[PDB]
Design a protein around this nucleic acid. Structure first.
Ligand code: MG
Ligand code: MG
Ligand code: MG
Ligand code: MG
Ligand code: MG
Ligand code: MG
Ligand code: MG
Ligand code: MG
Ligand code: MG
Ligand code: MG
Ligand code: MG
Ligand code: MG
Ligand code: MG
Ligand code: MG
Ligand code: MG
Ligand code: MG
Ligand code: MG
Ligand code: MG
Ligand code: MG
Ligand code: MG
Ligand code: MG
Ligand code: MG
Ligand code: MG
Ligand code: MG
Ligand code: MG
Ligand code: MG
Ligand code: MG
Ligand code: MG
Ligand code: MG
Ligand code: MG
Ligand code: MG
Ligand code: MG
Ligand code: MG
Ligand code: MG
Ligand code: MG
Ligand code: MG
Ligand code: MG
Ligand code: MG
Ligand code: MG
Ligand code: ZN
Lengths: 97, 52, 77, 135, 91, 252
RNA sequence: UUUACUUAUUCAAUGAAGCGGAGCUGGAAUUCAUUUUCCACGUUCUAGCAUUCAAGGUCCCAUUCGGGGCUGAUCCGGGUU
RNA sequence: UCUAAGGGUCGGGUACGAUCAACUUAGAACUGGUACGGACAAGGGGAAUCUGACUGUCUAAUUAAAACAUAGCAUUGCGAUGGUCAGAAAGUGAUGUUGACGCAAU
RNA sequence: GCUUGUGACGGCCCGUGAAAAUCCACAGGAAGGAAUAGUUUUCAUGCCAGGUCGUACUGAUAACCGCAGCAGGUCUCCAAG
RNA sequence: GAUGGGGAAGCUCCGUUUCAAAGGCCUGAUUUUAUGCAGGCCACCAUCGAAAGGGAAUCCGGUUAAGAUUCCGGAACCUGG
């Protein structure tokens, strides 16, 4: 599933976590896909969306809170947004997403 | 406050001595996006009307 | 109520239309750690502030006093 | 792309010029012994052209349409890159690193940039850029 | 060291009012002082501030809720009822 | 004898409401052109305790359609509504907790609060913490809507009368024992001067029908007629039955 | 006696603001000659912004700066609802 | 009259030193006409019966109580064109800035 | 250390603990403004004026109320070893 | 607690923004002239009620038989112009 694809990304690719860095990543044309927590406030969501479209980057809307997004990336804190810099051995990039 | 010069009652930004700055960051961002999404909203329903 | 330190600024004060009177006070005081030395405070009374200028150098002191406007009503001590 | 480049319009988001709109004229994507941050060199509009109408005649229009410009070194993280873009060739040379340092160099620059923007504005190229963002 | 065998917070009333009244109060006190999950920012930082008012330490949103608990059974069934009924109208 | 306690209440000298800390009266918007042809948006700005009340109030602000300014309104907050939330009021509004719609626009089964008894009266029914009314049917000809009040009563009102979706916040307030006299003290200190309460059976005859006797006791039936007279109505007024209620109540 | 009416009387509301009747357009709708009708007829991802008789259009004053009409904002009835 | 325990501040390449300033607590000697919380200050205790649960309250000036109150329990009225109450009357008034998780009455 | 002030926090509530005058700020951009010289009194300095009534003392085992220079009653601030 | 009002034989009782045609500011228009009209607003509809609540601004030293943050000396500050 999407989490298992995520979990592959995490253990074989490159990624950054959290608002500020995925904007650095978005500016630098580096992000290959961003994943957005169900409950991040619409304004941030709106902005990451504007940053993404300016950089021709695809967005995924994670069915679930920042609490669970962080468990999906195998981490014990919570994350509101994720940036794939490199699909590792996974295929998240070229599947449904 | 009437006994005291204007620079003691402002900071030199938009909404100076009134709103809090991180508050004005928010206002600006939200304004821009919403004014943009407005053009987005219009062009969709201009398209709905001609594809119906 | 107000202190002053620019010895040019001061001279201008003393000639400011509203400045009728002034006073000069002399204070024994001690230097660094050891010896003493003669301190002098020039006080110019303006309409709403008493401006006072402290000259520690007894030498600038003497010369300054000669520079005092010859119509001003100085109070010595 | 690396979308922060040679002609991007952006909204300033912090500090005095906050909320005003700029063009990037020269990007410093990473580095500077001074400014240790990604930062752009922008020319923006500080005092916008006030609106003008049919009632406005003679030299009231002339007054109404004056533009006060500004130039700024500003950290990337304080700009909202915009989808719009405005051509920057007529004052490429003018907004320089050397332009900052020495006030007199700054004032000269704005003189040019101001003449540039008032040209642009009359016969309304870049229409959006000359109308105040409200918030 | 476990300090009380069963009166918990209700220890403060000593011996007064009858064990069963203290039982009833204990339940709603635990309910009412507890820290809750914020729906909006996802931190557990919603504490009460006078019956029905529930507000978040950071992020600072306030949510009208039950007198002693953020969400009421009744409130919640109603929330889904409304949901169900709403969805009939654009469907 | 003398005027009894329940007659003195009416002149309300020391019996008026303790009103100083109150936030102001809770009311829906005035029923204007907006609310009655379309919808109008506000923002809940603040949800706040009102002394003497159980349910919190929600301060909600709307633009004035006819003048440049903000007009603030005092709602009773429904469970679930929150600061920053957008509130939609009007005929053409949509079925969300917090919005305010005329009962004619909401399907049978809808749950609502603060509903009007006539359109525009700005809200009368189901305001106390936890309460609500259920819509149980419509009669589109002569637009009426049948609802069921907290009390159990059914009543039909105009389909234009308005209501706000959901239940009033603060529920279960009464599940918790007061425990001490003092909490009732502070309870009634912010309401009105009705506490504590001497039993009439502890007063003298001058004072009350129940007063007097060499043992405490009422000495005649304590169920009093409807058509009894001021000074006589103490006890179980117009009581159609009496005694421990046995078995399921529940309006059928 | 029933059940209709509204101007008496009665109750609420609002700084008496958008009522009633028609018309424009969109269209569901099915045409038994062509329309017989019924609905609509600017706002819902976001804790921004919304005011100077409105910009636009158009006609005047005798071209000065200023300023006015109409339109933008359909018509009719003055029953505030 | 002794002993022990409990702290501060400083320089240390990318183990300790130096000093200054506080009554607490415990242990050990000695000592006296066996005294020493030396004045002051400062709970009598126990076992049961009756009775009100408690805290609170009253008869100012013969009754402080087992009386009143109280939380808790139960019953009654009422959806506003209403219930309870006020007023000689009223385009009058209390509850009511209220609405059954409410107000009023036992 | 003692008294008082104050801060950052924490406990409590079916209790969540006034109002108005008044002062400022911001959004707005009507307007009014320069080169042969304009704008500026929220920067400094400078000029004039500020009426009317109370103001002593006691505040208690003698200045108050208890028929009184009554062992009674009568609100409060300061506080050494 | 006045007032348009409504009761009351009446002394008066009710009501306080109430079922009222409820009033004044900013400058422009004057260069007969002193202030008529020209805009646009603002509809807030009395007033009394705190010497402990709110609140513009002063201090030190000296001085009397008896006054003093009030006089004298010095040095400040606020409000209006
Ligand atoms: Mg400042
Ligand atoms: Mg500005
Ligand atoms: Mg009252
Ligand atoms: Mg009482
Ligand atoms: Mg009792
Ligand atoms: Mg009782
Ligand atoms: Mg008795
Ligand atoms: Mg009797
Ligand atoms: Mg009887
Ligand atoms: Mg009896
Ligand atoms: Mg009995
Ligand atoms: Mg109306
Ligand atoms: Mg030691
Ligand atoms: Mg007892
Ligand atoms: Mg007791
Ligand atoms: Mg007695
Ligand atoms: Mg006793
Ligand atoms: Mg006694
Ligand atoms: Mg019992
Ligand atoms: Mg009448
Ligand atoms: Mg004290
Ligand atoms: Mg608080
Ligand atoms: Mg301020
Ligand atoms: Mg004009
Ligand atoms: Mg000044
Ligand atoms: Mg005067
Ligand atoms: Mg005195
Ligand atoms: Mg005496
Ligand atoms: Mg005495
Ligand atoms: Mg009166
Ligand atoms: Mg007064
Ligand atoms: Mg006072
Ligand atoms: Mg005072
Ligand atoms: Mg003195
Ligand atoms: Mg004298
Ligand atoms: Mg004296
Ligand atoms: Mg003096
Ligand atoms: Mg002087
Ligand atoms: Mg002045
Ligand atoms: Zn939160």
């Amino acid at each position: 599933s999407i989490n298992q694809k995520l979990a592959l990304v995490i253990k074989s690719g490159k990624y950054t976590l959290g608002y500020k860095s995925t904007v650095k990543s978005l500016r630098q044309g580096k992000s290959k896909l961003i994943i957005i927590a169900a409950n991040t406030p619409v304004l941030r969501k709106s902005e990451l969306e504007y940053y993404a479209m300016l950089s021709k980057t695809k967005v995924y809307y994670f069915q679930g809170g920042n609490n669970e997004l962080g468990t999906a990336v195998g981490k014990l804190f919570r994350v509101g947004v994720v940036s794939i810099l490199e699909a590792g051995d996974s295929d998240i990039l070229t599947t449904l997403a | 406050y009437a006994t005291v010069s204007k620079t003691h009652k402002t900071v030199s930004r938009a909404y100076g001595g009134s709103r809090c700055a991180n508050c004005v960051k928010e206002r600006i961002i939200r304004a821009f996006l919403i004014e943009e999404q407005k053009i987005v909203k219009k062009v969709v329903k201009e398209q709905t009307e001609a594809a119906k | 109520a107000r202190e002053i330190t620019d010895i040019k600024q001061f001279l201008e004060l003393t000639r400011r239309a509203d400045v009728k009177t002034a006073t000069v006070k002399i204070n024994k005081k001690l230097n660094k750690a050891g010896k003493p030395f003669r301190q002098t405070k020039f006080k110019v009374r303006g309409s709403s502030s008493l401006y006072t200028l402290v000259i520690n150098d007894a030498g600038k002191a003497k010369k300054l006093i000669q520079s005092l406007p010859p119509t001003l009503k100085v109070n010595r001590l | 792309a690396k979308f922060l480049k040679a002609g991007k319009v952006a909204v300033v988001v912090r500090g005095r010029y906050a909320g005003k709109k700029v063009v990037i004229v020269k990007p410093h994507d990473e580095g500077s012994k001074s400014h240790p941050f990604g930062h752009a060199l922008v020319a923006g509009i500080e005092r916008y052209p006030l609106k003008v109408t049919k009632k406005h005649g003679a030299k009231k229009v002339a007054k109404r349409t004056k533009i006060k410009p500004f130039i700024k070194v500003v950290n990337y993280n304080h700009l909202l890159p915009t989808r719009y873009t405005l051509d920057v060739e007529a004052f490429k040379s003018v907004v320089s690193t050397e332009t900052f340092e020495q006030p007199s160099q700054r004032e000269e620059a704005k003189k040019v940039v101001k003449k540039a923007f008032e040209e642009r504005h009359q016969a309304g190229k870049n229409q959006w850029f000359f109308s105040k963002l409200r918030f | 060291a476990k300090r009380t065998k069963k009166v918990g917070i209700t220890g403060k009333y000593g011996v007064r009012y009858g064990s069963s009244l203290r039982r009833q109060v204990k339940k709603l006190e635990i309910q009412q002082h507890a820290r809750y999950d914020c729906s909006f920012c996802g931190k557990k930082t919603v504490k009460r501030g006078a019956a029905g008012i529930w507000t978040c330490s950071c992020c600072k949103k306030t949510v009208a809720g039950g007198a002693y608990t953020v969400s009421t059974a009744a409130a919640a069934t109603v929330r889904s009822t409304i949901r169900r009924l709403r969805e009939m109208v654009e469907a | 004898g003398r005027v009894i306690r329940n007659q003195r209440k009416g002149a309300g000298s020391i019996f008026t409401s303790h009103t100083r800390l109150r936030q102001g009266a809770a009311k829906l918007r005035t029923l204007d052109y907006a609310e009655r042809h379309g919808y109008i948006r506000g923002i809940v700005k603040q949800i706040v305790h009102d002394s003497g009340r159980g349910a919190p109030l929600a301060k909600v602000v709307f633009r004035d359609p006819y003048k440049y300014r903000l007009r603030e309104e005092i709602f009773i907050a429904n469970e679930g509504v929150h600061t920053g939330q957008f509130i939609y009021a009007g005929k053409k509004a949509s079925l969300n907790v917090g919005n305010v719609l005329p009962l004619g626009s909401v399907p049978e089964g809808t749950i609502v609060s603060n509903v009007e008894e006539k359109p525009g009266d700005r809200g009368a029914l189901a305001r106390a913490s936890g309460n609500y009314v259920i819509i149980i049917g419509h009669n589109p000809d002569e637009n009426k809507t049948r609802v069921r009040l907290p009390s159990g009563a059914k009543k039909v009102i105009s389909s234009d009368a308005r209501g706000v979706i959901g239940v009033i916040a603060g529920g279960g307030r009464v599940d918790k024992p007061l425990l001490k006299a003092g909490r009732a003290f502070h309870k009634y200190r912010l309401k009105r001067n009705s506490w504590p309460k001497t039993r009439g059976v502890a007063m003298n005859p001058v004072d009350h029908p129940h007063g007097g006797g060499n043992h405490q006791h009422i000495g005649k039936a304590s169920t009093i007629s409807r058509g009894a007279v001021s000074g006589q109505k103490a006890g179980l007024i117009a009581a159609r039955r009496t005694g421990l209620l046995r078995g399921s109540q529940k309006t059928q």
